[PDB]
Amino acid sequence: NPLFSPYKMGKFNLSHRVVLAPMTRCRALNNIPQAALGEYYEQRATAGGFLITEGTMISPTSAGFPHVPGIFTKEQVREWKKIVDVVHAKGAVIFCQLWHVGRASHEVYQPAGAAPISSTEKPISNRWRILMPDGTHGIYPKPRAIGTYEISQVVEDYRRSALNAIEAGFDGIEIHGAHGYLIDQFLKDGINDRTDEYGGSLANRCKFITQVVQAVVSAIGADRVGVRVSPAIDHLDAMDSNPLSLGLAVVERLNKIQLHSGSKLAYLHVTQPRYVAYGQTEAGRLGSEEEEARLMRTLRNAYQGTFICSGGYTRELGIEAVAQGDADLVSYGRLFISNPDLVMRIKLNAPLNKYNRKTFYTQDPVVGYTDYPFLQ
Amino acid sequence: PLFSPYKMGKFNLSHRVVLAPMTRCRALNNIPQAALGEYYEQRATAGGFLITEGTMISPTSAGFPHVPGIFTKEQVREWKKIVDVVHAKGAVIFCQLWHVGRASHEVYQPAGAAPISSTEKPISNRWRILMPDGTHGIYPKPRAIGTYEISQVVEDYRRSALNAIEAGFDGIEIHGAHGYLIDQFLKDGINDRTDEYGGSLANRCKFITQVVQAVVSAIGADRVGVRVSPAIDHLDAMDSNPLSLGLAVVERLNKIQLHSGSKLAYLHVTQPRYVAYGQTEAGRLGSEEEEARLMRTLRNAYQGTFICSGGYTRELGIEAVAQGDADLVSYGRLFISNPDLVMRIKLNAPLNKYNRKTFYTQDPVVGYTDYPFL
Ligand SMILES: Cc1cc2nc3c(=O)[nH]c(=O)nc-3n(C[C@H](O)[C@H](O)[C@H](O)COP(=O)(O)O)c2cc1C
Ligand SMILES: Cc1cc2nc3c(=O)[nH]c(=O)nc-3n(C[C@H](O)[C@H](O)[C@H](O)COP(=O)(O)O)c2cc1C
Ligand SMILES: [Cl-]
């Protein structure tokens, strides 16, 4: 089983290639990591296994979900420390994902009920909803387009949060630059309608992610920085006219940062679109995943370093990915929510527990969080 | 509730369990076979309603191998034999008229002509077609038919509906869903025409209206059912406002009934069962709520019998009928493996699992008529 051949990610000697994908769960009450998070990550930690935390706030305006943890205050750093320690005690490697949602927020999540910030004044359309604190779905509002100086301030928020993650003991950080969030709002030409140096050309649209990555790299070292993007996922109206061209443009910027820094990043993590095959239709089962696979393979081939694939992977698809050289590591989200011992279940080819979407974002410290059972 | 009798026009149905139309590819060389007779006979029940697999309305309307047609007198002759066996068991049966539009291939095109459609745009690479040898083929570039050709395709539906009646069917169902010909005109994500049949919702609905009117004027509204799927992920068939499109179709169907002075047999709607973006943070938020509203809105708007389909089980079907969401529920996959699904559902008995591997094979028995009764 290729998922169990060891992999050397920088200094880290991973014992297997099954990675815990970053997943927002909303148990960090009032943005403070809670003991429940410690139990949750400890359940999933394995010796030589790599874990990525849920998206974590880099500032007071960075959230668009309730009770997501932050790492911009010392109080938050002290609580993260306890989680990092328990995970390290199991022999796992863990990175903290730094997340700013940009326009994907609501006044209820902003200080003084201010408008969310973004590259643009254009709001996410009503084709999408936001989870409100009371559990209902809300409408995304119009964001405020930020200027060059404020952009440098947000970059500084990433730098300060990366330093704090290192202070908490994390092995590194992952820049959430995917799924239509703040960085993707600058990358995607379907969102970025700016006329200044951060808009228009591919170079201009890639300026923001480059500045963010360079700032964290210069603060903690490229080896402790992973980058996540999703050029072909249009979640929250984040489409680009040419996904592959955009993805390759980002990859070249990362390749350039590495050469200039004289060091490689921890990895490039890419989420791919995954089309569920509907069995109730005439030709749903006759589809092909070919094209989306070629896009992923091209980004991996273009990138000089470790590649982590994600998005609807199963045991069989993960084995295939590593076996064909399409990826070095494979991250799993939903199956890891319901299978604390996912790594062991994939090693033994055991049945996998079903997951309950209803409790993905609820606040209970146990229910739908740490009560999914281990192999008996 | 599924066994509470239902009156569908002049049809007194004994239960609400319907056999959904399902392509099975056993009609060798497009001619109905004795096998189909046994297959349908097996699932037929006294006072039960069945809808046949999609059936060709012209030589160029197919996109699957060995699907039956009803555009030749020979085909009509063989269908009659099947219809008789079904009536013998006291069941009501409608023949579904199917034209795939752009969802075709050169191998299914007698004159090597490009498949016809509303647009010049080909189905995307992520969708494939089933080839005669069982392999998957690539969808070719279709031809955006001219305004004048639309009338002749409507004529193909009309002649086919007449042929279905000549064959003895109690009625016909217009397949206007799942990204096939009619749906290629309805969905603004496909229809990029700038003429009378493109642009406004009204213009987009012109084709299905003309098809339904032609068949209604040929055999009577009481013998015509119509199937649509305002919101479905199949062969790149998307629309900006699924609700608006669905209600536009319902409004024109209601008008055809008023002007005809008789109601259609029913409106058949596929349940979206939308599951896109499950791998994202917010993709699924509000999805289930929107499709539920979409369906109830259409059900409340349509003046007549409403049949739901797509992902239904014994429990989900019971719920649909109990909550007033649908009058009849059609089952597809479970009916493939459970010939006596009706009886089984009635007794809450164990259901047989189905083998997809044999959904479209040509064996007249294996995976077709060999599923056990129990
Ligand atoms: C409940 C949930 C929360 C998520 N939260 C995040 C997040 O905070 N950051 C991120 O980059 N991706 C997030 N994702 C996307 C996942 O990291 C991952 O790409 C996806 O779950 C992989 O597909 P899979 O679930 O089929 O394994 C989330 C996904 C789910 C289902
Ligand atoms: C093998 C197969 C063939 C189908 N063929 C057709 C068809 O020719 N026409 C049509 O309108 N729907 C067709 N359908 C869709 C079904 O009528 C029905 O909506 C679907 O099977 C219902 O979902 P269920 O299988 O979960 O009950 C087909 C479905 C399957 C699984
Ligand atoms: Cl390191």
> What is the b/e burial string over A183-198, where b = at least 16 CB atoms within 10 angstroms of the residue's CB?
bbbbbbbbbbebeeeb
- For residue A362, what are the CA distances in angstroms to A70, A135, A367, B255? 18, 8, 9, 47
Terminal C-alpha separation, chain B: 22
Q: Which letter does DSSP use for residue B145 in this model?
A: -
Whole-angstrom distance, CA of residue A226 vs CA of residue B202? 51
> What domains appear along chain A, each with residue ranges and CATH number?
1-376 (3.20.20.70)
Whether the CA torsion A210, A216, A219, A225 is positive or negative: it is negative
Given ligand 2 and candidates B23, B99, B342, B355, which is best to mutate, with the most ligand atoms within 8 Å of its CB? B23
* Residues from chain A contacting residue B98 (CB–CB below 8 Å): none
- CA B66 to chain centroid: 17
**Burial of B210 from C-beta contacts in 10 A (0-12 / 13-18 / 19+):** middle
User: Does residue B358 have its Cβ closer than 6 Å to ligand 2?
Assistant: no
Span from the CA of A21 to the centroid of ligand 1 (angstroms): 6
What's phi and psi for A288, nearest 5 deg?
-130, 140
Nearest Cα neighbor of B251 from B237, B230, B236 is: B230
- Residues A109, A140, A181, A303: which is the catalytic one? A181
Resolution (A): 1.5
- Residues B139, B180, B197, B266: which is the catalytic one? B180
Instruction: Mark yes or no for CB contact B127/A285 under 8 Å.
Output: no
Which residue from A65, A279, A311 is facing B333, i.e. has the nearest CB? A279
Question: How many residues in total does chain B contain?
Answer: 374
- For residue A270, what are the CA distances in angstroms to A117, A247, A248, A288? 24, 10, 12, 20
Nearest Cα neighbor of A313 from A305, A304, A323, A303 is: A323
* Residues from chain B contacting residue A357 (CB–CB below 8 Å): 278, 284
Q: Which of B53, B124, B281, B337 to mutate to test the interface with A (most CBs of A within 10 A)?
A: B281
- A120 Ramachandran zone, left/alpha/beta (phi>0; psi -120 to 50): beta
Known active-site residue A181: yes
* Residues from chain B contacting residue A124 (CB–CB below 8 Å): none
* Residues from chain B contacting residue A286 (CB–CB below 8 Å): 127-130, 136
Nearest CA to ligand 1 atom 22: A311
> How many interchain CB pairs under 8 A, A with B?
96
Instruction: Chain B: give the shortest CA distance to residue A24, in Å.
Output: 7
Whole-angstrom distance, CA of residue A228 vs CA of residue A230? 7
- Tokens for A118? 């973004």
DSSP-assigned beta bridge partners for residue A56: A98
Instruction: Mark yes or no for CB contact A280/B311 under 8 Å.
Output: yes
HEC per residue, A71-117: CCCHHHHHHHHHHHHHHHHCCCEEEEEEECCCCCCCHHHCHHHCCCE
Whole-angstrom distance, CA of residue B233 vs CA of residue B237? 6
Structure-solving method: X-ray
Give the number of other Cβ atoms within 10 Å of residue A136's Cβ: 10
Whole-angstrom distance, CA of residue B110 vs CA of residue A281? 26
Instruction: Mark yes or no for CB contact B286/A334 under 8 Å.
Output: no
Whole-angstrom distance, CA of residue B370 vs CA of residue B365? 6
Contacts of A75 (CB under 8 A, 6+ apart): A32
A interface with B, Cβ–Cβ < 8 A, is 24, 55, 65, 104, 128-131, 137, 179, 233, 235-236, 271, 274-276, 278-292, 310-312, 333-334, 357
Instruction: Mark yes or no for CB contact B282/A312 under 8 Å.
Output: no
Contacts of B111 (CB under 8 A, 6+ apart): B60
Instruction: Chain B: give the shortest CA distance to residue A262, in Å.
Output: 34
